[PDB]
């Protein structure tokens, strides 16, 4: 199974989960305060692990890029933290965001004179440090994809503890406040103005669906601000659509490069034929955020984040996602299919990725990059099979016409998994968080073989076959 | 953890388990008849899998040696099947084996004229075919260790079905018949006379302890001839000691190379301090076969086959090996230590190998080669940890003085595991037994890195740490 000559192999990172770990890298944000919050820790809503004990990529990026380059990687999708670049509010620096009566952003203008007003309140040292990180990769002749938003917001934008206690009208309320979108536009323009020379492709945001659904509906997730409101979820979703559009327009003012979005795509399956039509509607609804962006002519490419599936059946006269399949499988166990489940309880289901890419190709006809795919597997028992089987899924979808430009694993290294902390280890490379030392897992060597040869060679082909990891 | 420049890395094979699989390779022996026996299959004593559906190394050796060479291996210990070389009886060809009154072989002479008598009744085509196999490896500049006996006997030597039914006085009875030793001596001389130019080091036999203990005591093992007699086990043991001594003397008639023995060494541990002295006695007794050979000045080197441990405690006023540890752990599960157990139920216990090598060094002060070490692991979930952790054990023992010359994994490929059949897969390389195709496992890539660099490099060092595979 050979990939095209220019098909990219690499990995993705985020600021919050990778940067901190060593002195001089701490930065406050909503997510910082959230994971440090004593109530959240004591209730078990978050793990008690803290991101400032993480892999210290802020300091150690050159060494990680060395590992990446030796694994045959030629593309990295990374992040830039708003909370770092603008630690103080930008509200008083006015720009032109034009909206229609329905609240759609129709145009933006952040003139050069305003970029210079922004410089004076930005942390330019942090901006230059990001340049050092990105340039260290770029100078090796490699591709860099910069994703503008990967969940943490500045605290002057969102104070989630205050929102959960007093309500969103009483405190800075994140994506529930219209003006957050306008401040994000200023940030997007600022970043593009300065960093376009280091960036090959842009993404406005990562997994906005996770932000709004987990923050305001699925509270067991332990995402900020964690108060239940379907109206709030809808408002944050609406605002995040506009944040994409504004940011797209902001970037295009200062860049000719492609601008896409990175999205969480579960594959949705019916347990039986009778539920097929209902599940087809659930797919449409679940992916509608992307559909909207594509339909407005505001997507040049799609970043596909794929990890697992959801399987649907009836429970008490209602169609629901079922325990024992997909993301709802037993941690460290097996799905009801017999497929192994990751340390996170996510079923190994590469068929989902093949189905998904064919569906997305047909739906949007856009270039796609697999921007995340991986598994929580602290001993590397299953990752090699996960890696090769999902890469074969991508190959198979490409043969049926999907325009896939690369595959980025989640991730190069273990990192801080949000409310779960460090116990979910997604790396091709193990990190000792006490020493910051990096150690290869065997999956890393498998990756290197495939990436260097641009192909799943026949000697590694059996790693796509899940027979010997599947029960019964 | 760097090994010495001439420390050897490689693998081991046996005739019965590897050779057969494709037309033209089938050969009769006691073990052939045993595994084909309808009663044994129906009772579940053997698996019903048949060796003639195996990896077909008789035909495919050049392709497996290619894999081995690319994995950085420079040594193979292989076999030669007595049942192939002498398919008809050799009894009428007389030689001089001198014994003392206590039954010890004091000298052997198999003159050149008698070697030529033997040629006329040998299967010389099989001998030449073995030469093609060994030479294919040797021609690459690599080391070959030839082991003369790896369990199957000619049927004219042993008819195990008839022995189990009618008793050893009523049929050819294998190592219960004194003359088997004399016939083995003829074989050993024949082999050395012809093949010494292809052989770097000799072994007379592999795991003689398994032959006598499993065939005559531990009948649940499904080893031939499978009738219970402590007296028989003692007689087979005594005869196998003499077979080693006879073969050593035979080989030395036609070779200047080192002659050793390959032995199964379980590491024995007390569950608690109160059982320590009893376990020390159990070690002495369990290894006494090797102690005898060394004490007679008939061992130039020791082949250490190490897989796991046995842990001892009191049960019903008796000290016994305990369920839930070592070789007596749950298949596919965990030992009571929390360590993972292989598909065979054998606890991952690298400390055992370190302890063993130090013990053997002190006991015998001989050069040692790890001639087997591996695990039944059909999806490679645990093998990489098993491989690196046991290699670190070897390194650690060498640092304390053990004279270890190389490490040979069991094995390069999946193969026929005796009474268990194909269900126990010990390969760095997976074999599809229907197609005979070989596929690398990630542990093979790990092995390649270590072998090519003569060291466990720091990036692979965490594979020696069993924390993330060990429960609670």
Numbering used by the authors:
A (entry chain Q), B (entry chain P): 1 to 472
Study authors write:
β-Glucosidase from Pyrococcus furiosus (BGLPf) is a hyperthermophilic tetrameric enzyme which can degrade cellooligosaccharides to glucose under hyperthermophilic conditions and thus holds promise for the saccharification of lignocellulosic biomass at high temperature. Hyperthermophilic archaeal BGL (BGLPf; family 1) has also been isolated from P. furiosus and holds significant potential for the complete saccharification of cellulose at high temperature when combined with EGPh. BGLPf exhibits high hydrolytic activity towards cellooligosaccharides at high temperatures. The thermostability of BGLPf is affected by its oligomeric structure.
Therefore, in order to disrupt these intersubunit interactions, we constructed a BGLPf mutant (R170A/R220A/Y227F) in which Arg170, Arg220 and Tyr227 were substituted by Ala, Ala and Phe, respectively. Crystal structural analysis showed that the BGLPf-M3 crystals belonged to space group C2, which is different from that of BGLPf-WT. Diffraction data were improved to 1.70 Å resolution and the structure was refined. The four monomers of BGLPf-M3 in the asymmetric unit were named subunits P, Q, R and S. The root-mean-square (r.m.s.) deviations of the Cα-atom positions (1–471) among subunits P, Q, R and S are less than 0.27 Å. Furthermore, the r.m.s. deviations of the Cα-atom positions (1–471) of subunits P, Q, R and S of BGLPf-M3 compared with subunit A of BGLPf-WT are between 0.27 and 0.31 Å. These results indicate that the overall structure of the monomer is not influenced by the mutations. Molecules of glycerol, which was used as a cryoprotectant, were observed in the putative active site of each of the four monomers of BGLPf-M3 and were also observed in the BGLPf-WT crystal structure. Two types of alternative dimers (PQ and RS) are formed in BGLPf-M3, with residues Arg381, Tyr382, Arg448, Glu449 and Glu459 controlling dimer formation.
